[PDB]
From a paper:
The performance of this subset was validated in two fragment screening campaigns using the model system endothiapepsin (EP) and the [name]–[name] complex of the [name]. As a second and real-life target, we addressed the [name]–[name] Zika protease which is crucial for the viral life cycle of the [name] but with its shallow active site challenging to target.
The protein construct contains the soluble part of the membrane bound [name] and the protease domain of the [name]/helicase protein of the [name]. The [name]–[name] Zika protease construct was cloned into a pET-DUET-1 vector, with residues 46–96 from Zika gene [name] and the protease site from [name] (residues 1–177) (courtesy of Martin Scanlon Lab, Monash University) following the design of Li et al. 2018, with an engineered C143S mutant to prevent crystallographic disulfide bond formation between neighboring [name] copies as seen by Lei et al., 2016.32,33 The [name] part has an N-terminal His6-tag followed by a TEV protease cleavage site. The [name]–[name] Zika protease was crystallized with some optimizations as described by Huber et al., 2022 by mixing 1 μl protein solution (40 mg ml−1 protein in 20 mM HEPES, pH 7.8, 250 mM NaCl, 1 mM DTT, 5% glycerol) with 1 μl reservoir solution (24% w/v PEG 2000, 0.2 M ammonium sulphate and 0.1 M sodium acetate pH 4.6) in hanging drop trays. For the second fragment screening campaign LigandFit and PanDDA were used to identify binding events. One of the fragments interacts directly with the catalytic His51. Eleven of the binding events are at crystal–contact interface sites.
Residue numbers in the entry:
A (entry chain B): 18 to 28, 32 to 156, 160 to 170
B (entry chain A): 49 to 88
Write the structure that this text describes.
Amino acid sequence: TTDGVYRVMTRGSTQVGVGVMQEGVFHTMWHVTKGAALRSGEGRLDPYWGDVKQDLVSYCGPWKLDAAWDGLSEVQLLAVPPGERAKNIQTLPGIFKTKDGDIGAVALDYPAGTSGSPILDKSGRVIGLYGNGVVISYVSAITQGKR
Amino acid sequence: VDMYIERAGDITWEKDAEVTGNSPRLDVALDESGDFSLVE
């Protein structure tokens, strides 16, 4: 239940993704878990909110992350790759231009087990999650939910 | 099959992070299944 970034593992064992614990709620991408329940030691986390189109899911409570890229500043991907210590990768986002407005995007390509890793602003706030994007090389949207 | 979680770190900005990656501007569409595709 501690705040932080977490590996999402499956059973040998395999890392399928990453997520963010904040304010008692676990946040990850829908395609990582498909809404399955999660074990946390002896405890169980059940899905609470999910949306395939946003590709997000929250456990134990509603989506809590609400910070947004400012459109100008560099950000940091807090990547947690399989088999590797959590590490920060700083970048200037590009932009996904859509009929419903612009979304930040990071042109960084890490293993699929890294999906769900948080993208941070300089204040340390999570502005979205890494791992839903397009191929031009892979480019990931900065995917943020609604609080 | 059961999924489980393991803590991997604090959520913190790191002053000495590696810096890399370009900043492309792309027109895209997002469909009902959550898939982004390119648009022209």
